[PDB]
Design a protein around this ligand. Structure first.
Ligand SMILES: Nc1ncnc2c1ncn2[C@@H]1O[C@H](COP(=O)(O)OP(=O)(O)O)[C@@H](O)[C@H]1O
Ligand SMILES: Nc1ncnc2c1ncn2[C@@H]1O[C@H](COP(=O)(O)OP(=O)(O)O)[C@@H](O)[C@H]1O
Ligand SMILES: Nc1ncnc2c1ncn2[C@@H]1O[C@H](COP(=O)(O)OP(=O)(O)O)[C@@H](O)[C@H]1O
Ligand SMILES: Nc1ncnc2c1ncn2[C@@H]1O[C@H](COP(=O)(O)OP(=O)(O)O)[C@@H](O)[C@H]1O
Ligand SMILES: Nc1ncnc2c1ncn2[C@@H]1O[C@H](COP(=O)(O)OP(=O)(O)O)[C@@H](O)[C@H]1O
Ligand SMILES: [Mg+2]
Ligand SMILES: [Mg+2]
Ligand SMILES: [Mg+2]
Ligand SMILES: [Mg+2]
Ligand SMILES: [Mg+2]
Lengths: 367, 367, 367, 367, 367
């Protein structure tokens, strides 16, 4: 009966059976809708495209992320990608499987109660559970202590975790993520003349960001090497055939994580928020959090991130203690693995929220 | 009850029953009128000749195209060739058959409303439909995506079409066609001394254009081979018996499609308008339009057109992507086939505009 | 009431009832007047002889053609032969019969208005019509298309006629005819010593021309055969009893139709005027005129004319097309037949010009 | 060295030195040839007469226009009148003077290349130029913008001209001219009985046309005044002594320019061709062409032409804008003046085609 | 020495001295080039026309905007209109005056560096400055806070501005402007049959748009009044003389600013982009931006725009707060005034970029 693990982040749905190594259905969380009223006969009609099909037809469709910063914005578009996820990639009636869902910490109470009420009533699930992302990534590391920085498409979190337990007062969320970085790469890219206005083109630039962009050890050094453009300008090719050449834009896009002042936000960079999170923790356990800080999420995949983190957190923290940062390959897969182990565990099966139980239990019990 | 498909282009009426392979009545759209008041008794009188009969008696008649650039100029001459088409070639009362009519895109609203009001009130049709030409040619190709270049006698169109839908903002019409090319061949032919002033002679030159003329891969190369006149001068024989010899005029007539500056029009050639049409399309779908661009119409029949298109569109488009041009034999037949399939389809029968419905519906509903 | 058909050409009046096969009264159009004041008692006096009676007494009378080149020269001499035609050969009061009259094309407006005013006022005709000669000959051929060459005694015409209608701008008249040929045969005959000065003798030579003269296929060939006079000299016998012997004069008289330079006229021969008439016609219909050119009139009766026409028109026209010349026996009868059929037709009876109507209608309506 | 300006139109050669006010040698373009082989001793012999001498002896000669509709028909007759023009009226060796020649627009390429090859090789000219007629007439008006209607003996043109430049696609040629009008006046005159068959008589009728004929403001009004023949019948006297009386024929001859259907041509009248020429022009410049339309040529000399043009073009053009027609006295002189100014100009002397240069340059460079 | 203010927008150059009230030279930014190779002598030649002269001769010339969407497309055509602006309207050597230039926000770095390098090197300017358009319009309002919507011919901007400072992350550019609206008015106008294909005619329709078009308070209401065409159809007169009658097209052209889906663009209308711009701003200052939103540019001149903005922004924003829109007459003049005041200010004279300084400073300093 094993179990279903659905990681519902902004940008990507990572779903699959528990106890496995990698999610089997990994497709973007979009509901495309035809922009031009196809005045033809037979076309589709396919009033709504979802996921990969919508991706294939980007030029026709208006792409619409149903989930913004972890918050569910549109509730039937979410339903759409869930139904599509259960019957056209996983091929699985939810009635045979308990379902472990995912969500960001410090998230409105409207996401856990409406989410369970849909899973339970529209789909029929024997039992379900909603888990905080960073704890699952810690299971995937195979560790019980550490401070997780999970930066996905919607949200970046810091969740300090000591020997099991948690520290809710030190959990720090920050809306800086791949979606904010791809928009900033939009208006920074347009100073070269390349205009990407539409949602379909936004996912093209998302592609440029995934391949070319990198986090400088020192951005000023990168700027210096860039002035005489030797290796910093690279040629990327669109699907149309044109040639984009991006130099300093390659690295100054991800610099936004460490200098949110480029987007016009006062929030400290992700190194002062992980540092500030360790500050709020009790003086005893900070040495273990400094040593064990973990990384997860697609927005942790920029080459050079871990090294810049080690330079900057080692500059804010007292130099007498060792700051080891553990950033394993397969991060996106790693987050899923931690959730799967918990479903595997012979001690978590008591914590499922039964569907029959849930209606009596109400929203509050789940939270 | 099957259906009637009437392709009303300038120059040729292609009409016949739906579900068939080729139109059965293919005759020129002309209403000849005696030029010299035959001062004889018994002759005709045949105050009006139409189609093939008018063609046979060109020397007596003033030939008058009722439709200029897709726009209906004279409305009872149009009625004349319709009545003639229904009772003397198709032999068919329009009351038994729904009628699919044709028209060019981006055409004045006076053609669809006056056309349906005639079909409905003068003839009596149970139901009818007016369809955009390029979409029918795409059905005839047996394809759902591509950019159609339909060059007939009145008008040349570019209609980009992606996966069903359409892109109205990228539809580009251009008044360059067999009628404009036959007039340019008129005044270019007269530099050899052959004077064709009359409308009857215009259709002779239309005949010369159909047989001899060809589109150079490189016109300058053709000019060079022409200076020493080896194969470029060919002998054509009129119906009178005289011998015309045309050299570079054979190829420089159709060069007007790619260099409209020979007629004194600023519009770009048909390769910059198909290129410009693909430009206005969203960056995602342009690779499919480059690969799938389709051709239709009598003015696509000049030998050498497809190859010149591939040289010129491959010179404007980024050389990294494949520009395949599909130009099947039987183009003139092909346009008709796409319309017939739609009548055949078990999903288009809902879209007919009932005659009774039309009067209540008004002009606007049809459009 | 059937109808009266009067063909009033120079030289011969061909009159009779409509619907018949041949004119019944065929007599020359002359008004003889005694030259020597017969100083006898009882003789005649017959102050005026007309037609056959005048012919019988040629030696006494001055013969006077009332109609020269189609133009009516003397109007009471014309009246004389009309009155004689109606009461002494046709025996018929014109009041019972509508009368179809004849005239050459491109003829002064004084002949149609004075002619109708006489028919109407001096004779009393219920209704009448004046028709162009060549169209009547075309009816007699039983055909609707062709180019008629009608050469009578006064005038030679070319009237191109396509499918009914006419081509007035291509009608070409030329004053070369039996009267001009008989005068040229006069002064060419006098080089043998035979002097014919008088009008009575002119009609003798007209007789010699009708029997002996012939149109050479090649006149130079005829001249060569003539130098050694074997078959080219023939013996003709006058009414007096003397013997005339004419050799090359037999054929060089009708050569004037093809070489008007023998009479001192610049006009091209009748083969360049039929060729030039087909030139002025629209390029489409010329192949039918080349194939269908018709012949009529007494001056088409010279043996050898049709063959010489075919050699000469085939030498001026492009050799790629077939020039058939149709010259049926019974030409003189043939012209009459075409007019009779029109009177017979159940559609021409509307076109009669009523005598009562004519006075109100005036000269202009008739034309 | 000043220059030679030779205006070689059909019917008249207007030649003289540049910078002058009027051409000095103005004589008809004819090569007379004796029709009757003068069997006398001493006469001439003058195997060929040319120009004025041929005119004096019209009764002996066959007159032969060497140039028909602008096209050179016979090339040594043309040479004849050129040689005669250079040595017996201008008295001038062409080797001292560059020669500006004239020709109609849209004229076969055989006239510019054979014309220059003769000027260059038979005569010896240092340099020469061939100019389009209507542009020279525009120089004579002293203006840079306007639409020229030049109607000479062979051809009528419309050449729209805006601010300098030209509009080749709007140039409209039409074979209606004094030669076509004098032939139509031939067969219309013959309905009064006056038969003019010969070429010598054609130039008599050309004289009648020049003096008496006039263009009605309204031809129907002229017809009404003519029915009661008060001022419309005028007496003209031939050189023989006979008296011709022509009424409505006076005005209905030039009506052919506005109703080409009298000659059997489909071409629109000269007011619909000047109107149609302004149509083909870009919407911006049409108001200047309507206001500035110019007139030139001998066939513009009929009294009443300008007023009829203003009534008819003002009836076809939107009545909201002013149609001024400028038709200055001295038209025939005016065309010559525009060419002379260009030779005078200190900027056209670069555009001469050197004789030495021409042989290397070939026919194509001149065109 | 006062100063030069050159507002280089697409469509219009507004230039003049600082401290004045209105720009003195206001002429369109076009470089006309003769389309038909004027085969005349003396004409121009004027190989290039610029501004008003090019406008006068639209029918001859190909008009070519050198600046598209704020981006400089052709750099010597730009140079052309600058040189023309400095010596033939302002009459002023740039060496005596520092020059304040204009540009749109979020514009490629190729426009500020190439623009200064030309101003500095081709012209010689002591010092110069390039300023963001919307800030100058705010100076012209005489205010320090507000959100500027500047819609010109190339680009529409929203620039929120609080108490001096700026908010770069909230600046929102959108390529919808008079050029896009005049093209849409092109293909919408052609459904009435009026075909405007050429660039010269595009500026005619630009004229029609400027006078007749208006922004409906409710477009559906306008459509209803239009069905019974009482006041919605107005008669406009071209320069040719023809009469255009435009009904619903008058208002549905500018509806494109609020419904970009008519051109096939996904971008929200200008009321959702000004609303979305205020969203991105910090919660504190939004009440002042709602109250103070300013308007500038030629595309803000459609009658009815401000009222429609107030209905639509008041429908998106919480109804508890006052949305005052300030749209003063003289907008086009207003933008210039704000720039002139800054030149006038005794505190901006330090911010000039010296020409000598600029070469050392490089492109980056200017930006
Ligand atoms: N290789 C990469 N390099 C940089 N950024 C990436 C890469 N892959 C994905 N991203 C960014 O990270 C996001 C995916 O992260 P993910 O962990 O799937 O987020 P979530 O789990 O919230 O859906 C994408 O939106 C993309 O912008
Ligand atoms: N074999 C040919 N080669 C070149 N041109 C042709 C040929 N056949 C027809 N045309 C031109 O194309 C026109 C016919 O095209 P068609 O597709 O029938 O136009 P429509 O559908 O608008 O009537 C004719 O007017 C002729 O000028
Ligand atoms: N058998 C003949 N051979 C040659 N010429 C003839 C013959 N018969 C008649 N002609 C000539 O033709 C004339 C008669 O032709 P006809 O058709 O009667 O002319 P019309 O109809 O004008 O009177 C006579 O004047 C005579 O000169
Ligand atoms: N006064 C006149 N009135 C009417 N027609 C005239 C007059 N003078 C000349 N023409 C006609 O115009 C012709 C002369 O025109 P012209 O301008 O010399 O032609 P081109 O320049 O082609 O030789 C003559 O053939 C004559 O028929
Ligand atoms: N009265 C008007 N009504 C509507 N639109 C106008 C009017 N005047 C100008 N426009 C449009 O605005 C444009 C001029 O705006 P402008 O502020 O000069 O733009 P820019 O400053 O970018 O040159 C023109 O291209 C025209 O299309
Ligand atoms: Mg995540
Ligand atoms: Mg077609
Ligand atoms: Mg006869
Ligand atoms: Mg002339
Ligand atoms: Mg502006």
């Amino acid at each position: 009966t094993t179990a279903l693990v659905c990681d519902n982040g902004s940008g990507l749905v990572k779903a699959g059976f528990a106890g496995d190594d990698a999610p089997r259905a990994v497709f973007p969380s979009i509901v495309g809708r035809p922009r031009h009223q196809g005045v033809m006969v037979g076309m589709g009609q396919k009033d709504s495209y979802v996921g990969d099909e919508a991706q294939s037809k980007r030029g026709i469709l208006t792409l619409k992320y149903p989930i913004e910063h972890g918050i569910i914005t549109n509730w039937d578009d979410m339903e759409k990608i869930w139904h599509h996820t259960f019957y056209n990639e996983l091929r699985v009636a939810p009635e045979e499987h308990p379902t472990l869902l995912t969500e960001a910490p410090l998230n409105p109470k409207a996401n856990r109660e409406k989410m369970t009420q849909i899973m339970f009533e529209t789909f029929n699930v024997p039992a379900m559970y909603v888990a905080i992302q960073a704890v699952l990534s810690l299971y995937a590391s195979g560790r019980t202590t550490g401070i997780v920085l999970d930066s996905g498409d919607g949200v970046t979190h810091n969740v300090p975790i000591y020997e099991g337990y948690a520290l809710p007062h030190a959990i720090m969320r920050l809306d800086l993520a791949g979606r904010d970085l791809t928009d900033y790469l939009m208006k920074i890219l347009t100073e070269r003349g390349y205009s990407f206005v539409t949602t379909a083109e936004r996912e093209i630039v998302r592609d440029i960001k995934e391949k070319l962009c990198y986090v400088a050890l020192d951005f000023e050094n990168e700027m210096a090497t860039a002035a005489s453009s030797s290796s910093l300008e690279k040629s990327y090719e669109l699907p149309d055939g044109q040639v984009i050449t991006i130099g300093n834009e390659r690295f100054r896009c991800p610099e936004t994580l460490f200098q949110p002042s480029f987007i016009g936000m006062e929030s400290a960079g992700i190194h002062e928020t992980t540092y500030n999170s360790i500050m709020k923790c009790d003086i005893d356990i900070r040495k273990d959090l400094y040593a064990n800080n973990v990384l997860s999420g697609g927005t942790t995949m920029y080459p050079g991130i871990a090294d810049r983190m080690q330079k900057e957190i080692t500059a804010l923290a007292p130099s007498t203690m060792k700051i080891k940062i553990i950033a394993p390959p397969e991060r996106k897969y790693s987050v899923w693995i931690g959730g799967s182990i918990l479903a595997s565990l012979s001690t978590f099966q008591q914590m499922w929220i039964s569907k029959q139980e849930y209606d009596e239990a109400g929203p509050s019990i789940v939270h």
